Structure formats: structure tokens, C-alpha cells
Design a binder for this molecule. Structure first.
Ligand SMILES: [Mg+2]
Ligand code: NA
Length: 354
């Protein structure tokens, strides 16, 4: 039986010369056993859901700040840094954004002059949203996910841009405007990130690289790349992760690991173990080895890596469970962290604290 997280060495203290150690949180997790773990180990947090666009402006002019504010207050109370996730995404984003003045979806418009008017209207809505949120949180936020997941996994166009509703209506302009507007209101010292998953694998990595270089060439203010790092035990390789970070560092950009979890399964995540107890020890040991290697790499690259955030706290709450259940007939349990569901340490904890 392993000791509780609050009886072992602080991970934030361990990594204080190298990078922040962060966790994704929900407002209901800032008390009790999760609050205890968070205060002991982490010096950074991010909102899992409460700061996404639909969570902040669910209808036009109506802002819902309470969940977000609760997360900011916790960060402030405990001297934590704060990532803002996220100003722009194609999911968890309110429908009203993309309706024209008559109330119909902008993608349905065919008349060229009305499409141009719709584009202008959407970019204006984007600016007001960004302005309002940034004005509220600029003094608390230490890194912004300005845009999230705007690069595609395939090659639908030559630039590899995701053809979401944002792209369909504005092309790449929404990305430009998001960074320009964030810089404008948050000030020159705000750290502006483009965040994405599979930043380690081609062709996506190269599309992202090319995007960043294009935008930099046009003077668009991008300070860093967010590597979601939703990874597996054997995939991606240590070298693929290294090469990605080194590429972006080479452009003068900061790297952050933003949503790290180490799944016990492949993609798709099957076969999955039906419960936490059914998970065999080898999986935790294999995961410990993986975590060791990751964090040695992270330390090696610490001149170009400022923060490492896990997409959760302990194994009792992870979006990876939803995924497991989805490909295993409604039953499955993943275990991605260094703390187990009872907040006791796992083998991976020892292997990254040493
Ligand atoms: Mg180690
Ligand atoms: Na660093």
C-alpha cells in the first residue's frame, strides 16, 4: 500500500528549476482530497471546461463567470500560475456565434456579399469575446491558449488547416484576429499559445510548423506552442516528442505541455480493462518507465519548456474513461496519472520525483 500524495515530495518543488507542474481542474474539485493534492504538488492550474467559450458566453452579452472565477480564486489563494483554456475552439463554443443577423447559419449563405458581411460579423463577435475575457483575467493568466486545435489531422487543404465552421466562414483570419486581439488587450508581456494534439506526428506537426512560420512572417504575435500530449505508453516515441519541441524552439517559440495523460491503451483504446482493480501491475510499471523517460526528456529540454500540465489530478477523474467506454461497449477504465483514485502514489510517481 502506497503513501498518500500529500506525504511525498512536491513535484512543483522537484521541477522548480525546469518548469511549472500543473493540473486541469473543475470548480467542484478545489476542496477535499483534490484540493489537498493540488496545494501539495502543483504550482499551476487550468480549467478543464469552465473557461471554454460556451462556458463563458453561452448567449450574446450574457457572461457566466462563476465557475471560472472560482478556479482563478483558488489559483490566487495558493500562489499558482494559470493557463487560460481557451479563447477559440470549434467545440464547446456557442451556436449563436455562427448565426447571421436573420438567425440562419452562416455556412448556408451563398451570396458572396452576405458571406463577407457574415465573416466581418463573426470576427467582430470573436474580438468582443476575447476583449471581455482578457480584460477580466489578464492579471491572473500566465499563458493563453488563444486558439485550440486549428490544424487538421489530414491534408484537406494545402496548409493542413482544420475546416471547421471558423475556417469555412473566415479562412485563417480567425486565427490572426485571435492572436492580434489577445496581444492588444492582454499587453506585450502576455504569453500567447497555439495549442494542439498530435504535435509530434507528421503531417500535422509540419502543417503546424508552417502555420506558425507563416503567421510569424506576417507579424502575428505567437509566443509558444502547446503540446496537448494525449499520448500512449509506446506512442509517440521520445525522439518524435523531442524533434517537435526542438523545431518550435528553433522558431524562437516557447513550448508547454498542456494536457498530458499517459493512457494504458492504444488508439482506439481497446481492449480496455472493465474496472480499475482489473488493471494489472505490469501496466502501471510500463507506465512508470514511460513517465520516467518523458520527464528526463522534459528536463533535458527545460531551456525551451516552461510548463508541464497533466489533464487531471488523480485516476478518479479522467476524460480518457469516456473514450474507453465508447470503444468497449460502455465499460472501461483508464489510469493516466501518477496518483491513483484514492490519491495514493503510483509507481510512476517515484520514477519522476527521483
Ligand atoms: Mg526519473
Ligand atoms: Na524552463
Amino acid at each position: 500500500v502506497q503513501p498518500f500524495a500529500w506525504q511525498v515530495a512536491s513535484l512543483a518543488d522537484r521541477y522548480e528549476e525546469s518548469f511549472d507542474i500543473g493540473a486541469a481542474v473543475e470548480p467542484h474539485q478545489l476542496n477535499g482530497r483534490q484540493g489537498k493534492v493540488l496545494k501539495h504538488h502543483y504550482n499551476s492550474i487550468v480549467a478543464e471546461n469552465a473557461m471554454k467559450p460556451i462556458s463563458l458566453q453561452p448567449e450574446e452579452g450574457v457572461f457566466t463567470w462563476d465557475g471560472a472565477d472560482a478556479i482563478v480564486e483558488f489559483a490566487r489563494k495558493n500562489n499558482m500560475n494559470l493557463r487560460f483554456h481557451t479563447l477559440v475552439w470549434h467545440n464547446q463554443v456557442p451556436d449563436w456565434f455562427f448565426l447571421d443577423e436573420e438567425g440562419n447559419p452562416m455556412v448556408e449563405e451563398t451570396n458572396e456579399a452576405k458571406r463577407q458581411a457574415n465573416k466581418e460579423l463573426l470576427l467582430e463577435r470573436l474580438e468582443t469575446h476575447i476583449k471581455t475575457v482578457v480584460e477580466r483575467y489578464k492579471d491572473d493568466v500566465t499563458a493563453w491558449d488563444v486558439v485550440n486545435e486549428v490544424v487538421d489531422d489530414g491534408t484537406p487543404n494545402e496548409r493542413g488547416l482544420r475546416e471547421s465552421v471558423w475556417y469555412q466562414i473566415t479562412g485563417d483570419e480567425y486565427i490572426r484576429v485571435a492572436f492580434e486581439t489577445a496581444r492588444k488587450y492582454a499587453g506585450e508581456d502576455a504569453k500567447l499559445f497555439i495549442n494542439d494534439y498530435n504535435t509530434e506526428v507528421t503531417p500535422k506537426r509540419d502543417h503546424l510548423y508552417n502555420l506558425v512560420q507563416d503567421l510569424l512572417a506576417d507579424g502575428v504575435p505567437i509566443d509558444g506552442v502547446g503540446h496537448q500530449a494525449h499520448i500512449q505508453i509506446d506512442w509517440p516515441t521520445i525522439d518524435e516528442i523531442r524533434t517537435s519541441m526542438e523545431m518550435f524552439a528553433g522558431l524562437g517559440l516557447d513550448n508547454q505541455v498542456t494536457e498530458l495523460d499517459v493512457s494504458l491503451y492504444g488508439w482506439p483504446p481497446r481492449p480496455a480493462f472493465p474496472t480499475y482493480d482489473a488493471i494489472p501491475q505490469e501496466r502501471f510499471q510500463a507506465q512508470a518507465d514511460r513517465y520516467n523517460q518523458l520527464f528526463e526528456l522534459y528536463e533535458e529540454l527545460d531551456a525551451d519548456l516552461s510548463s508541464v500540465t497533466f489533464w487531471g489530478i488523480a485516476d478518479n477523474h479522467t476524460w480518457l474513461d469516456d473514450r474507453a467506454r465508447e470503444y468497449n461497449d460502455g465499460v472501461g477504465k483508464d489510469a493516466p496519472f501518477v496518483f491513483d483514485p484514492n490519491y495514493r502514489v503510483k509507481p510512476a510517481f517515484w520514477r519522476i520525483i527521483d
